[PDB]
PDB file of C-alpha atoms and ligand atoms in Angstrom:
ATOM      1  CA  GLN A  12       0.054   0.028  -0.115  1.00 46.83           C
ATOM      2  CA  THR A  13       0.447   3.777   0.469  1.00 45.64           C
ATOM      3  CA  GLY A  14       1.409   5.672   3.478  1.00 44.17           C
ATOM      4  CA  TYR A  15       3.598   3.673   5.206  1.00 42.69           C
ATOM      5  CA  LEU A  16       7.323   3.254   6.056  1.00 38.21           C
ATOM      6  CA  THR A  17       8.113  -0.753   7.017  1.00 37.81           C
ATOM      7  CA  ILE A  18      11.688  -0.563   8.077  1.00 37.24           C
ATOM      8  CA  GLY A  19      12.595  -3.851   9.724  1.00 37.44           C
ATOM      9  CA  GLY A  20       9.527  -5.138  10.334  1.00 37.39           C
ATOM     10  CA  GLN A  21       7.847  -1.746  12.421  1.00 36.02           C
ATOM     11  CA  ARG A  22       5.405  -0.417  10.273  1.00 35.21           C
ATOM     12  CA  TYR A  23       5.262   3.834  10.113  1.00 40.73           C
ATOM     13  CA  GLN A  24       2.455   5.530   9.295  1.00 40.12           C
ATOM     14  CA  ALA A  25       3.883   8.198   7.063  1.00 36.67           C
ATOM     15  CA  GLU A  26       3.993  11.310   4.776  1.00 35.22           C
ATOM     16  CA  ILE A  27       6.485  13.241   2.665  1.00 33.32           C
ATOM     17  CA  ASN A  28       6.908  15.766   5.217  1.00 31.21           C
ATOM     18  CA  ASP A  29       8.360  13.157   7.802  1.00 30.61           C
ATOM     19  CA  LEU A  30      11.247  12.884   5.406  1.00 30.64           C
ATOM     20  CA  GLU A  31      14.443  15.103   5.598  1.00 34.60           C
ATOM     21  CA  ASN A  32      16.027  15.504   1.795  1.00 35.67           C
ATOM     22  CA  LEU A  33      19.967  15.240   2.433  1.00 35.62           C
ATOM     23  CA  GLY A  34      20.872  16.057  -1.272  1.00 38.41           C
ATOM     24  CA  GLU A  35      21.068  13.658  -4.434  1.00 40.62           C
ATOM     25  CA  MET A  36      22.729  10.388  -4.521  1.00 41.77           C
ATOM     26  CA  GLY A  37      23.873  10.758  -8.446  1.00 41.45           C
ATOM     27  CA  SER A  38      23.349  12.194 -11.864  1.00 41.33           C
ATOM     28  CA  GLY A  39      21.706   9.417 -13.461  1.00 43.58           C
ATOM     29  CA  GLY A  42      16.022  10.558 -13.024  1.00 41.73           C
ATOM     30  CA  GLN A  43      16.192  11.708  -9.215  1.00 44.13           C
ATOM     31  CA  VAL A  44      17.373   9.514  -6.000  1.00 42.74           C
ATOM     32  CA  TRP A  45      17.449  11.532  -3.022  1.00 44.47           C
ATOM     33  CA  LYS A  46      18.293  10.469   0.574  1.00 47.32           C
ATOM     34  CA  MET A  47      16.278  11.082   3.018  1.00 47.61           C
ATOM     35  CA  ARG A  48      15.945  10.591   6.792  1.00 47.92           C
ATOM     36  CA  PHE A  49      12.570   9.908   8.540  1.00 50.34           C
ATOM     37  CA  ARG A  50      12.480  12.273  11.173  1.00 47.62           C
ATOM     38  CA  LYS A  51      10.359   9.758  13.477  1.00 47.86           C
ATOM     39  CA  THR A  52      13.104   7.209  13.732  1.00 51.28           C
ATOM     40  CA  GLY A  53      16.314   8.279  12.229  1.00 49.81           C
ATOM     41  CA  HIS A  54      16.791   5.902   9.507  1.00 47.26           C
ATOM     42  CA  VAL A  55      18.187   7.148   6.320  1.00 50.01           C
ATOM     43  CA  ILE A  56      16.446   5.761   2.894  1.00 48.33           C
ATOM     44  CA  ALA A  57      17.232   5.976  -0.576  1.00 46.21           C
ATOM     45  CA  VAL A  58      13.870   7.988  -1.794  1.00 46.33           C
ATOM     46  CA  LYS A  59      12.874   7.876  -6.076  1.00 45.16           C
ATOM     47  CA  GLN A  60      11.069  10.795  -7.112  1.00 44.03           C
ATOM     48  CA  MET A  61       8.358  10.064 -10.041  1.00 43.83           C
ATOM     49  CA  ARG A  62       7.008  13.985 -11.165  1.00 45.65           C
ATOM     50  CA  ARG A  63       3.348  13.892 -12.187  1.00 46.28           C
ATOM     51  CA  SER A  64       4.580  16.273 -14.864  1.00 47.63           C
ATOM     52  CA  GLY A  65       7.209  13.740 -16.352  1.00 45.80           C
ATOM     53  CA  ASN A  66       7.485  12.299 -19.602  1.00 45.94           C
ATOM     54  CA  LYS A  67       3.673  10.292 -19.799  1.00 48.89           C
ATOM     55  CA  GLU A  68       5.509   7.362 -20.679  1.00 45.62           C
ATOM     56  CA  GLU A  69       8.209   7.330 -18.797  1.00 43.88           C
ATOM     57  CA  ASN A  70       5.935   7.278 -15.847  1.00 43.11           C
ATOM     58  CA  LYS A  71       4.565   4.206 -17.089  1.00 41.90           C
ATOM     59  CA  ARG A  72       7.659   2.495 -17.029  1.00 44.66           C
ATOM     60  CA  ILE A  73       8.677   3.418 -14.085  1.00 44.18           C
ATOM     61  CA  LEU A  74       5.269   2.430 -12.430  1.00 44.83           C
ATOM     62  CA  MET A  75       5.610  -1.250 -14.501  1.00 40.36           C
ATOM     63  CA  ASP A  76       8.913  -1.803 -12.658  1.00 42.53           C
ATOM     64  CA  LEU A  77       7.976  -0.630  -9.041  1.00 42.83           C
ATOM     65  CA  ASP A  78       5.406  -3.194  -9.374  1.00 37.92           C
ATOM     66  CA  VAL A  79       8.097  -5.811  -9.812  1.00 39.95           C
ATOM     67  CA  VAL A  80      10.075  -4.070  -6.723  1.00 41.75           C
ATOM     68  CA  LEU A  81       7.101  -4.892  -4.604  1.00 40.56           C
ATOM     69  CA  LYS A  82       6.694  -8.113  -5.712  1.00 41.99           C
ATOM     70  CA  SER A  83       9.952  -8.823  -5.068  1.00 41.70           C
ATOM     71  CA  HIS A  84      10.539  -8.898  -0.982  1.00 41.55           C
ATOM     72  CA  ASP A  85      11.141 -12.636  -0.768  1.00 43.50           C
ATOM     73  CA  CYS A  86      14.202 -12.013  -3.004  1.00 39.38           C
ATOM     74  CA  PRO A  87      17.597 -11.498  -0.632  1.00 38.76           C
ATOM     75  CA  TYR A  88      19.270 -10.333  -3.408  1.00 40.88           C
ATOM     76  CA  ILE A  89      17.018  -6.994  -4.940  1.00 41.67           C
ATOM     77  CA  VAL A  90      16.903  -4.004  -3.251  1.00 41.64           C
ATOM     78  CA  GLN A  91      13.946  -3.398  -1.240  1.00 43.98           C
ATOM     79  CA  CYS A  92      10.804  -0.925  -1.258  1.00 42.87           C
ATOM     80  CA  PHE A  93      10.120  -0.320   2.581  1.00 41.89           C
ATOM     81  CA  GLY A  94       7.027   2.052   1.008  1.00 41.74           C
ATOM     82  CA  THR A  95       5.469   4.548  -1.457  1.00 39.56           C
ATOM     83  CA  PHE A  96       4.135   8.283  -1.006  1.00 43.84           C
ATOM     84  CA  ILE A  97       1.779   9.575  -3.495  1.00 46.72           C
ATOM     85  CA  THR A  98       0.563  13.699  -3.595  1.00 49.09           C
ATOM     86  CA  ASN A  99      -0.885  15.455  -5.581  1.00 49.90           C
ATOM     87  CA  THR A 100       2.195  16.176  -7.990  1.00 47.45           C
ATOM     88  CA  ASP A 101       4.563  13.157  -7.025  1.00 49.29           C
ATOM     89  CA  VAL A 102       5.066   9.861  -6.254  1.00 51.08           C
ATOM     90  CA  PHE A 103       7.723   9.130  -4.207  1.00 52.28           C
ATOM     91  CA  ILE A 104       9.452   5.318  -3.614  1.00 50.93           C
ATOM     92  CA  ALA A 105      11.397   4.762  -0.641  1.00 49.40           C
ATOM     93  CA  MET A 106      13.885   2.281  -1.168  1.00 48.14           C
ATOM     94  CA  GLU A 107      16.586   0.588   1.328  1.00 48.05           C
ATOM     95  CA  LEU A 108      19.918   2.488   1.345  1.00 46.66           C
ATOM     96  CA  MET A 109      22.626   0.805  -0.052  1.00 46.15           C
ATOM     97  CA  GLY A 110      25.946   1.854   0.376  1.00 46.38           C
ATOM     98  CA  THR A 111      27.210   2.283  -3.522  1.00 45.75           C
ATOM     99  CA  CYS A 112      27.101   0.246  -6.694  1.00 42.81           C
ATOM    100  CA  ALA A 113      30.130  -2.402  -7.592  1.00 42.11           C
ATOM    101  CA  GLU A 114      31.627   0.708 -10.691  1.00 40.67           C
ATOM    102  CA  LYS A 115      32.509   2.894  -8.388  1.00 41.20           C
ATOM    103  CA  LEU A 116      33.897   0.339  -6.042  1.00 39.66           C
ATOM    104  CA  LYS A 117      36.143  -0.489  -9.068  1.00 38.85           C
ATOM    105  CA  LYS A 118      36.515   3.347  -9.155  1.00 37.84           C
ATOM    106  CA  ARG A 119      38.011   3.650  -5.627  1.00 39.18           C
ATOM    107  CA  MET A 120      39.933   0.497  -5.381  1.00 36.65           C
ATOM    108  CA  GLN A 121      41.814   2.033  -8.967  1.00 33.76           C
ATOM    109  CA  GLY A 122      42.761  -1.930  -9.661  1.00 33.16           C
ATOM    110  CA  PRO A 123      41.239  -5.472  -9.821  1.00 34.66           C
ATOM    111  CA  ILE A 124      38.027  -6.570  -7.633  1.00 35.17           C
ATOM    112  CA  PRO A 125      39.341  -9.864  -5.585  1.00 34.43           C
ATOM    113  CA  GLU A 126      38.000 -13.121  -7.106  1.00 35.29           C
ATOM    114  CA  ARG A 127      36.256 -13.841  -3.492  1.00 36.39           C
ATOM    115  CA  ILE A 128      34.319 -10.676  -3.342  1.00 34.65           C
ATOM    116  CA  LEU A 129      33.393 -11.325  -7.157  1.00 35.08           C
ATOM    117  CA  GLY A 130      31.780 -14.894  -5.613  1.00 33.32           C
ATOM    118  CA  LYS A 131      29.498 -13.624  -3.658  1.00 31.91           C
ATOM    119  CA  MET A 132      29.027 -11.348  -5.851  1.00 30.84           C
ATOM    120  CA  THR A 133      28.092 -14.051  -8.670  1.00 29.64           C
ATOM    121  CA  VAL A 134      26.106 -15.953  -6.201  1.00 27.69           C
ATOM    122  CA  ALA A 135      23.652 -12.643  -5.374  1.00 28.56           C
ATOM    123  CA  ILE A 136      23.581 -11.533  -9.172  1.00 29.69           C
ATOM    124  CA  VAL A 137      22.936 -15.199 -10.749  1.00 31.11           C
ATOM    125  CA  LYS A 138      19.579 -15.692  -7.870  1.00 28.09           C
ATOM    126  CA  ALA A 139      18.862 -12.442  -8.469  1.00 30.91           C
ATOM    127  CA  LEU A 140      18.186 -12.954 -12.285  1.00 35.83           C
ATOM    128  CA  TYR A 141      16.554 -16.319 -11.736  1.00 35.56           C
ATOM    129  CA  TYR A 142      14.113 -15.254  -9.272  1.00 35.43           C
ATOM    130  CA  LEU A 143      13.024 -12.492 -11.781  1.00 33.03           C
ATOM    131  CA  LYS A 144      12.739 -14.909 -14.756  1.00 29.38           C
ATOM    132  CA  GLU A 145      11.549 -17.604 -12.407  1.00 30.44           C
ATOM    133  CA  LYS A 146       8.967 -15.716 -10.399  1.00 27.36           C
ATOM    134  CA  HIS A 147       7.822 -12.737 -12.475  1.00 30.27           C
ATOM    135  CA  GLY A 148       8.665 -13.799 -16.093  1.00 28.87           C
ATOM    136  CA  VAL A 149      11.099 -10.515 -15.906  1.00 29.99           C
ATOM    137  CA  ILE A 150      14.234 -10.959 -18.213  1.00 31.41           C
ATOM    138  CA  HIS A 151      16.764  -8.376 -17.231  1.00 32.60           C
ATOM    139  CA  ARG A 152      19.521  -8.408 -19.940  1.00 35.90           C
ATOM    140  CA  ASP A 153      21.890  -5.373 -18.534  1.00 37.62           C
ATOM    141  CA  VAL A 154      23.704  -5.970 -15.842  1.00 38.72           C
ATOM    142  CA  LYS A 155      26.262  -3.728 -15.507  1.00 37.29           C
ATOM    143  CA  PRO A 156      28.605  -2.766 -12.870  1.00 36.95           C
ATOM    144  CA  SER A 157      26.269   0.255 -11.708  1.00 40.03           C
ATOM    145  CA  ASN A 158      23.520  -1.934 -11.475  1.00 38.59           C
ATOM    146  CA  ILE A 159      24.929  -4.000  -8.562  1.00 39.64           C
ATOM    147  CA  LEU A 160      24.946  -2.525  -5.512  1.00 37.97           C
ATOM    148  CA  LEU A 161      26.704  -3.082  -1.682  1.00 37.51           C
ATOM    149  CA  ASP A 162      26.538  -2.006   1.501  1.00 40.93           C
ATOM    150  CA  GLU A 163      28.771  -1.937   5.203  1.00 43.04           C
ATOM    151  CA  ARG A 164      26.959  -4.544   6.079  1.00 41.36           C
ATOM    152  CA  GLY A 165      28.178  -6.540   3.289  1.00 43.36           C
ATOM    153  CA  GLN A 166      25.115  -7.664   1.253  1.00 44.65           C
ATOM    154  CA  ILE A 167      24.830  -7.641  -2.274  1.00 45.84           C
ATOM    155  CA  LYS A 168      21.675  -6.814  -4.491  1.00 46.70           C
ATOM    156  CA  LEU A 169      20.450  -5.786  -7.941  1.00 48.25           C
ATOM    157  CA  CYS A 170      18.494  -2.671  -8.922  1.00 47.79           C
ATOM    158  CA  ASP A 171      17.749  -1.283 -11.814  1.00 46.88           C
ATOM    159  CA  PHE A 172      16.138  -4.328 -13.816  1.00 48.97           C
ATOM    160  CA  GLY A 173      13.224  -2.881 -15.687  1.00 48.42           C
ATOM    161  CA  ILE A 174      12.024  -1.160 -18.631  1.00 49.37           C
ATOM    162  CA  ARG A 212      19.886 -16.362 -21.356  1.00 47.40           C
ATOM    163  CA  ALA A 213      21.139 -12.709 -22.810  1.00 49.28           C
ATOM    164  CA  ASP A 214      21.151 -12.156 -19.299  1.00 48.54           C
ATOM    165  CA  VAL A 215      23.909 -13.922 -18.445  1.00 47.83           C
ATOM    166  CA  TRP A 216      26.107 -11.904 -21.365  1.00 44.56           C
ATOM    167  CA  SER A 217      26.436  -8.965 -19.217  1.00 43.88           C
ATOM    168  CA  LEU A 218      27.126 -10.433 -16.171  1.00 41.99           C
ATOM    169  CA  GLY A 219      29.798 -12.490 -18.086  1.00 45.90           C
ATOM    170  CA  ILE A 220      31.248  -9.215 -19.331  1.00 47.82           C
ATOM    171  CA  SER A 221      30.634  -7.193 -15.845  1.00 46.27           C
ATOM    172  CA  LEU A 222      32.963  -9.763 -14.061  1.00 49.78           C
ATOM    173  CA  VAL A 223      35.349  -9.413 -16.438  1.00 52.23           C
ATOM    174  CA  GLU A 224      35.962  -5.815 -15.785  1.00 55.58           C
ATOM    175  CA  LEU A 225      35.301  -5.697 -12.669  1.00 57.85           C
ATOM    176  CA  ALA A 226      38.369  -8.750 -11.991  1.00 57.77           C
ATOM    177  CA  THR A 227      40.738  -6.877 -14.393  1.00 56.86           C
ATOM    178  CA  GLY A 228      40.419  -3.596 -13.301  1.00 55.62           C
ATOM    179  CA  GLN A 229      39.818  -2.551 -17.740  1.00 50.17           C
ATOM    180  CA  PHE A 230      36.001  -2.835 -19.686  1.00 45.99           C
ATOM    181  CA  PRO A 231      36.587  -5.022 -22.505  1.00 45.63           C
ATOM    182  CA  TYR A 232      35.008  -2.619 -24.986  1.00 46.35           C
ATOM    183  CA  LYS A 233      36.696   0.684 -22.999  1.00 47.07           C
ATOM    184  CA  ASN A 234      38.566   1.655 -26.814  1.00 42.71           C
ATOM    185  CA  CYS A 235      35.199   1.892 -28.794  1.00 43.25           C
ATOM    186  CA  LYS A 236      33.427   5.050 -29.219  1.00 46.42           C
ATOM    187  CA  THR A 237      30.031   4.152 -30.983  1.00 44.10           C
ATOM    188  CA  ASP A 238      27.482   1.729 -29.465  1.00 43.21           C
ATOM    189  CA  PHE A 239      27.559   0.350 -33.130  1.00 42.77           C
ATOM    190  CA  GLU A 240      31.211  -0.538 -32.513  1.00 45.33           C
ATOM    191  CA  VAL A 241      30.763  -2.247 -29.602  1.00 46.04           C
ATOM    192  CA  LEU A 242      28.061  -4.577 -31.342  1.00 48.41           C
ATOM    193  CA  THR A 243      30.272  -5.423 -34.396  1.00 48.14           C
ATOM    194  CA  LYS A 244      33.292  -6.328 -31.607  1.00 46.15           C
ATOM    195  CA  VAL A 245      30.828  -8.248 -29.678  1.00 47.91           C
ATOM    196  CA  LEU A 246      30.113 -10.519 -33.795  1.00 49.97           C
ATOM    197  CA  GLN A 247      33.518 -10.110 -34.880  1.00 48.67           C
ATOM    198  CA  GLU A 248      35.833 -11.157 -32.341  1.00 48.73           C
ATOM    199  CA  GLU A 249      36.056 -13.691 -29.633  1.00 50.20           C
ATOM    200  CA  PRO A 250      34.491 -13.539 -26.281  1.00 50.48           C
ATOM    201  CA  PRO A 251      37.132 -11.723 -23.936  1.00 51.26           C
ATOM    202  CA  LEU A 252      37.998 -14.311 -21.406  1.00 52.05           C
ATOM    203  CA  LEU A 253      39.922 -13.723 -18.193  1.00 50.87           C
ATOM    204  CA  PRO A 254      43.290 -13.564 -18.440  1.00 47.43           C
ATOM    205  CA  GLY A 255      45.388 -16.942 -17.262  1.00 46.63           C
ATOM    206  CA  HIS A 256      48.624 -14.595 -15.289  1.00 48.12           C
ATOM    207  CA  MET A 257      46.024 -13.145 -12.487  1.00 50.16           C
ATOM    208  CA  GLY A 258      45.939 -16.455 -10.430  1.00 54.13           C
ATOM    209  CA  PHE A 259      41.932 -16.669 -11.008  1.00 55.02           C
ATOM    210  CA  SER A 260      40.912 -20.228 -10.028  1.00 56.32           C
ATOM    211  CA  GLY A 261      39.938 -22.456 -13.036  1.00 57.87           C
ATOM    212  CA  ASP A 262      35.987 -22.329 -11.773  1.00 60.22           C
ATOM    213  CA  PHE A 263      36.190 -18.434 -11.849  1.00 60.70           C
ATOM    214  CA  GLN A 264      37.643 -19.239 -15.585  1.00 61.72           C
ATOM    215  CA  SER A 265      34.626 -21.806 -16.689  1.00 60.32           C
ATOM    216  CA  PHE A 266      32.082 -19.742 -15.192  1.00 62.18           C
ATOM    217  CA  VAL A 267      32.778 -16.781 -17.330  1.00 62.96           C
ATOM    218  CA  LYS A 268      33.631 -18.663 -20.542  1.00 63.61           C
ATOM    219  CA  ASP A 269      29.798 -19.941 -19.921  1.00 65.38           C
ATOM    220  CA  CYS A 270      28.906 -16.525 -19.485  1.00 66.86           C
ATOM    221  CA  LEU A 271      30.241 -15.804 -22.296  1.00 73.71           C
ATOM    222  CA  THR A 272      28.745 -18.703 -25.283  1.00 70.80           C
ATOM    223  CA  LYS A 273      28.082 -16.569 -28.344  1.00 70.67           C
ATOM    224  CA  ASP A 274      25.915 -18.782 -29.558  1.00 70.04           C
ATOM    225  CA  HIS A 275      22.637 -18.118 -27.533  1.00 71.45           C
ATOM    226  CA  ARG A 276      21.892 -22.378 -28.256  1.00 69.50           C
ATOM    227  CA  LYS A 277      24.712 -23.120 -26.537  1.00 72.63           C
ATOM    228  CA  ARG A 278      24.266 -20.703 -23.392  1.00 73.31           C
ATOM    229  CA  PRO A 279      22.988 -22.701 -20.665  1.00 72.47           C
ATOM    230  CA  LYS A 280      19.765 -22.695 -18.426  1.00 70.01           C
ATOM    231  CA  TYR A 281      19.670 -21.058 -15.089  1.00 69.34           C
ATOM    232  CA  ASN A 282      19.383 -24.426 -13.147  1.00 71.51           C
ATOM    233  CA  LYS A 283      22.552 -25.310 -14.673  1.00 73.15           C
ATOM    234  CA  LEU A 284      24.286 -22.525 -14.534  1.00 70.89           C
ATOM    235  CA  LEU A 285      22.957 -22.590 -10.399  1.00 74.87           C
ATOM    236  CA  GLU A 286      25.120 -25.859 -10.371  1.00 74.25           C
ATOM    237  CA  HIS A 287      28.712 -24.500 -11.719  1.00 75.81           C
ATOM    238  CA  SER A 288      31.298 -25.053  -9.442  1.00 74.73           C
ATOM    239  CA  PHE A 289      32.048 -21.569  -8.867  1.00 75.80           C
ATOM    240  CA  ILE A 290      28.571 -20.558  -7.437  1.00 72.85           C
ATOM    241  CA  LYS A 291      28.352 -24.172  -5.237  1.00 73.23           C
ATOM    242  CA  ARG A 292      31.534 -22.482  -3.755  1.00 73.85           C
ATOM    243  CA  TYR A 293      30.961 -19.114  -3.192  1.00 73.45           C
ATOM    244  CA  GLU A 294      27.261 -20.240  -1.910  1.00 75.97           C
ATOM    245  CA  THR A 295      28.954 -21.999   1.224  1.00 76.87           C
ATOM    246  CA  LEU A 296      32.253 -20.099   1.806  1.00 75.11           C
ATOM    247  CA  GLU A 297      32.848 -17.433   4.145  1.00 78.94           C
ATOM    248  CA  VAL A 298      33.669 -14.337   2.763  1.00 80.83           C
ATOM    249  CA  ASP A 299      34.300 -11.214   4.388  1.00 82.37           C
ATOM    250  CA  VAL A 300      32.625  -9.129   2.347  1.00 81.43           C
ATOM    251  CA  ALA A 301      31.526  -6.038   5.011  1.00 82.66           C
ATOM    252  CA  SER A 302      35.030  -5.558   6.047  1.00 81.74           C
ATOM    253  CA  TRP A 303      36.503  -5.206   2.655  1.00 82.74           C
ATOM    254  CA  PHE A 304      33.980  -2.975   1.413  1.00 83.26           C
ATOM    255  CA  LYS A 305      34.928  -0.870   4.492  1.00 80.87           C
ATOM    256  CA  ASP A 306      38.421  -1.162   3.528  1.00 80.04           C
ATOM    257  CA  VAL A 307      37.546   0.497  -0.124  1.00 78.40           C
ATOM    258  CA  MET A 308      35.180   2.960   1.122  1.00 76.84           C
ATOM    259  CA  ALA A 309      38.096   4.645   3.408  1.00 77.42           C
ATOM    260  CA  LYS A 310      40.762   4.706   0.237  1.00 78.66           C
ATOM    261  CA  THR A 311      40.367   8.612  -0.953  1.00 78.10           C
ATOM    262  CA  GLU A 312      40.448   9.705  -4.679  1.00 79.54           C
TER     263      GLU A 312
HETATM  264  C1  2GI U   1      27.082   3.477  -9.801  1.00 78.04           C
HETATM  265  C2  2GI U   1      25.843   3.369  -7.721  1.00 78.04           C
HETATM  266  C3  2GI U   1      25.545   5.347  -8.284  1.00 78.04           C
HETATM  267  O1  2GI U   1      25.615   5.964  -9.508  1.00 78.04           O
HETATM  268  N1  2GI U   1      24.026   5.431  -8.735  1.00 78.04           N
HETATM  269  C4  2GI U   1      23.304   6.407  -8.904  1.00 78.04           C
HETATM  270  C5  2GI U   1      22.724   7.585  -7.853  1.00 78.04           C
HETATM  271  C6  2GI U   1      21.957   6.849  -6.758  1.00 78.04           C
HETATM  272  C7  2GI U   1      22.431   5.281  -6.801  1.00 78.04           C
HETATM  273  N2  2GI U   1      21.703   4.158  -5.883  1.00 78.04           N
HETATM  274  N3  2GI U   1      20.255   3.979  -6.641  1.00 78.04           N
HETATM  275  C8  2GI U   1      19.797   3.339  -5.808  1.00 78.04           C
HETATM  276  C9  2GI U   1      18.197   2.773  -6.127  1.00 78.04           C
HETATM  277  C10 2GI U   1      17.542   2.546  -7.471  1.00 78.04           C
HETATM  278  N4  2GI U   1      16.460   1.889  -7.139  1.00 78.04           N
HETATM  279  C11 2GI U   1      15.770   1.636  -8.500  1.00 78.04           C
HETATM  280  C12 2GI U   1      14.362   2.352  -7.661  1.00 78.04           C
HETATM  281  C13 2GI U   1      13.321   2.057  -8.612  1.00 78.04           C
HETATM  282  C14 2GI U   1      13.028   2.397  -9.611  1.00 78.04           C
HETATM  283  C15 2GI U   1      12.306   1.984 -11.081  1.00 78.04           C
HETATM  284  C16 2GI U   1      10.686   1.724  -9.941  1.00 78.04           C
HETATM  285  C17 2GI U   1      10.888   1.209  -8.560  1.00 78.04           C
HETATM  286  C18 2GI U   1      11.901   1.650  -7.722  1.00 78.04           C
HETATM  287  N5  2GI U   1      16.803   1.421  -5.485  1.00 78.04           N
HETATM  288  N6  2GI U   1      17.743   1.866  -5.609  1.00 78.04           N
HETATM  289  C19 2GI U   1      20.358   3.185  -4.504  1.00 78.04           C
HETATM  290  C20 2GI U   1      19.985   2.413  -3.390  1.00 78.04           C
HETATM  291  N7  2GI U   1      18.717   1.611  -3.015  1.00 78.04           N
HETATM  292  N8  2GI U   1      21.229   3.225  -2.249  1.00 78.04           N
HETATM  293  C21 2GI U   1      22.552   3.218  -2.528  1.00 78.04           C
HETATM  294  N9  2GI U   1      22.482   4.078  -3.789  1.00 78.04           N
HETATM  295  C22 2GI U   1      21.629   4.089  -5.060  1.00 78.04           C
HETATM  296  C23 2GI U   1      22.877   4.482  -8.145  1.00 78.04           C
END
């Protein structure tokens, strides 16, 4: 419903004035950091203006529909409530720390395989959930779509309006090497040509990566979409099985990276 914030199982009757605007979070729509004055909780709030593009507002509302129905997925950023006014809709989301793209930028180098292993488990399980439970096929996982927090959580966001597995492959190569495989392309069509004309960009062999990690990326980067595997097969990959159970302190790694300067 609307007019309520649910944070940690406690349900709070609320209105937009109960929220203090602490500033915009990034350059791209409008997502604000806000403080719920009644408790001190801080949340991320997407603002949809009534005066915006009519067709584009319909697309936000269809995504919101998925987000609202995704409360049983631990790998998707959760919605805490909505506020509807005469001129706006405000969508309250759990506040995450930052995205993988920014972690890569602050690290100024490769992200370790153990972190990418936990990230792969989260993302694959998020994508499979969206397919199996909602018929949603997200095809552009990218480092800017993968959020992390100082509690070590990893969740997908901005996934609305198989093919999915290629973009996960490319994101993993970019984050593992510190280098976007298509950085030297000056147009989107040039990237398309490279994808079709060149061999897939696999992980290098001189960086200590496990055979499992290399195999997983090679599987994601299968060019012939008929040979791309099913989700129930990808979820059995030895790379996933290892990082489902291996204890990795993502939280401390996150805090260490964020404490670096630029
Ligand atoms: C690479 C990180 C980055 O630059 N950005 C841009 C600024 C905001 C950052 N950010 N986004 C969210 C977020 C987005 N959503 C989806 C909202 C939605 C869209 C359509 C329909 C319904 C809902 N949910 N969360 C952030 C969160 N939650 N925390 C921190 N930063 C966030 C990403």
